[PDB]
């Protein structure tokens, strides 16, 4: 690599994030915050994905 080389021949740093979704419990969760549990009533739920 040289800094005078064209953009085809310039350094690029690559990070590939690969997520696996198995039957195991999910450990990597987003920054969404939990709410209180509401029972015996029809709700729209997101239970750990």
């Amino acid at each position: 690599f040289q800094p005078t080389n064209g953009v085809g021949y310039q350094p690029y740093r690559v990070v590939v994030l690969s997520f696996e979704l198995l039957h195991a419990p999910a450990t990597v969760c987003g920054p969404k915050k939990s709410t209180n549990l509401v029972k015996n009533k029809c709700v729209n739920f997101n239970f750990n994905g």
Binding site: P3, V7, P11, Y12, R13, V15, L17, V28, G30, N46
Partner: protein
């Protein structure tokens, strides 16, 4: 590390904020396969593998499912059923010296 010895890190047991990756404007290539890129925050994943390396500019298009090339054949091959994102940014200041 180099592309033949690409570095894999295991991310688990934490809260991942993918918004800081998405809002910042330095990543020239941000291509997700199997996952909508703007819907990264609400999903939960079991484990994440982060593979980091350095390649030249015409070799960025070979980091994709089903593509061919020197990097795809001999250095780094993605599966055709790949689920995740490829995040590539220019690093000409950090990885080039004159000469």
């Amino acid at each position: 590390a180099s592309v033949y010895a690409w570095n894999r890190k295991r991310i688990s047991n934490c809260v991942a904020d993918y918004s800081v990756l998405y809002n910042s404007a330095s990543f020239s290539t941000f291509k997700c396969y199997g996952v909508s890129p703007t819907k990264l925050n609400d999903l939960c994943f079991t484990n994440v593998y982060a593979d980091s390396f350095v390649i030249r500019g015409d070799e960025v298009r070979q980091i994709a499912p089903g593509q061919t090339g020197k990097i795809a054949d001999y250095n780094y091959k993605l599966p055709d059923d790949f689920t995740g994102c490829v995040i590539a940014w220019n690093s000409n200041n950090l990885d080039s010296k004159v000469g």
